[PDB]
From a paper:
Crystals formed for PCHAS_1200500 and contained three copies in the asymmetric unit. A complete dataset was collected to 2.15 Å, and the structure was determined by Sulfur-SAD phasing, using anomalous scattering from the sulfur atoms found in the five disulfide bonds and six methionine residues in each monomer. A complete model was built for residues 5 to 242. Another 20 residues, which connect the ectodomain to the predicted transmembrane helix, are missing from the C terminus, suggesting that this domain is connected to the membrane through a flexible, disordered linker. The CIR ectodomain adopts a compact α-helical structure, arranged into two distinct clusters of helices. The N-terminal half of the ectodomain is formed from five tightly packed helices connected by long loops largely lacking in secondary structure. This packs against the C-terminal portion of the ectodomain, which is folded as a cluster of three parallel helices, connected by short loops. Five disulfide bonds stabilize the fold, supporting the hypothesis that the CIRs are surface proteins, because disulfide bonds are characteristic of proteins located in the oxidizing extracellular environment. The surface opposite this attachment site is dominated by a long loop that links helices 1 and 2. This is one of the most flexible regions of the domain, containing the residues with the highest crystallographic B factors.
Only a few parasite proteins are exposed on host cell surfaces, and these have mostly diversified into large protein families, allowing a population survival strategy based on antigenic variation. More ubiquitous across Plasmodium species are families of small variant surface antigens (VSAs). These include the CIRs of Plasmodium chabaudi and the VIRs of Plasmodium vivax, often known as the “Plasmodium-interspersed repeats” (PIRs). To determine the structure of a member of the PIR family, we focused on proteins from P. chabaudi, often known as CIRs. These consist of an N-terminal extracellular domain ranging in size from 28 kDa (236 residues) to 133 kDa (1,331 residues) in the AS strain.
Residue numbers in the entry: 5 to 242
């Protein structure tokens, strides 16, 4: 679905607002953006004192926003799985950026900082479901199974998000869509080659739908205001 239009927008919004000194992607458009999701401090309302508090609140804000993409905020099993995967991919990227954190500390960070935030159980609809915990655990395990490629894979996802942002502003006149799609497929082919990615690996097959569905939707949307022959997404290392 055209879900990446919103996912890419929401991730950019939370990135600029993370307020963490060591991580800088931009200026916060709204200082109160995730304040509603800050963890409690000594039984009192949270203000987000630590970097872990801000990441935790930012992650919950993401999940809450992604669920809004579903009709009536009622996500199917497939939507819950897809949105948990996007949020946990972003979380892996953040932990990889943070010094003294990483994909190796992701499971620990989730249990000690996300499940620990009182706003996770009350605002994320599926938080208490055992089916949801299984989805989250699988996504965390997938990040660990692919830990060596996850930071570079995220850069490819970011390049895909840049095309979605361009389409969002140009609307029916994204004249550079074909040129950008060709640069994207070449950049992705280089990612497979440089990292010796076996696209038939079980773990890689479960993160690949983020790019394969995302790219397929993007070129279908560009071909709504133009008429171009877009290159197919690379299938293997070359």
């Amino acid at each position: 679905a055209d879900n990446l239009k919103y996912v890419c927008k929401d991730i950019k919004k939370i990135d600029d607002c993370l307020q963490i000194d060591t991580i800088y992607t931009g200026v916060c458009s709204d200082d109160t953006l995730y304040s509603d999701y800050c963890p409690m401090k000594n039984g009192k309302k949270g203000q987000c004192e630590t970097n872990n508090d801000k990441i935790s609140a930012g992650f919950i804000w993401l999940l809450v926003m992604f669920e809004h993409i579903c009709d009536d905020d009622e996500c199917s099993q497939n939507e819950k799985d897809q949105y948990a995967g996007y949020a946990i991919l972003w979380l892996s990227y953040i932990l990889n950026q943070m010094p003294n954190e990483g994909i190796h500390t992701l499971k620990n960070f989730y249990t000690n900082h996300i499940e620990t935030n009182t706003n996770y159980a009350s605002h994320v609809s599926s938080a208490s479901d055992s089916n949801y915990k299984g989805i989250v655990d699988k996504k965390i395990d997938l990040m660990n199974m692919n830990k060596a490629i996850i930071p570079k894979f995220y850069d490819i996802f970011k390049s895909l998000c840049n095309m979605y942002n361009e389409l969002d502003k140009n609307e029916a006149n994204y004249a550079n869509c074909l040129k950008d799609a060709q640069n994207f497929v070449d950049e992705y082919q280089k990612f497979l080659n440089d990292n010796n990615v076996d696209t038939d690996d079980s773990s890689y097959k479960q993160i690949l739908p983020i790019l394969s569905n995302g790219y397929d939707n993007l070129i279908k949307k560009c071909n709504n205001g133009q008429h171009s022959n877009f290159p197919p997404l690379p299938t293997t290392k070359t």
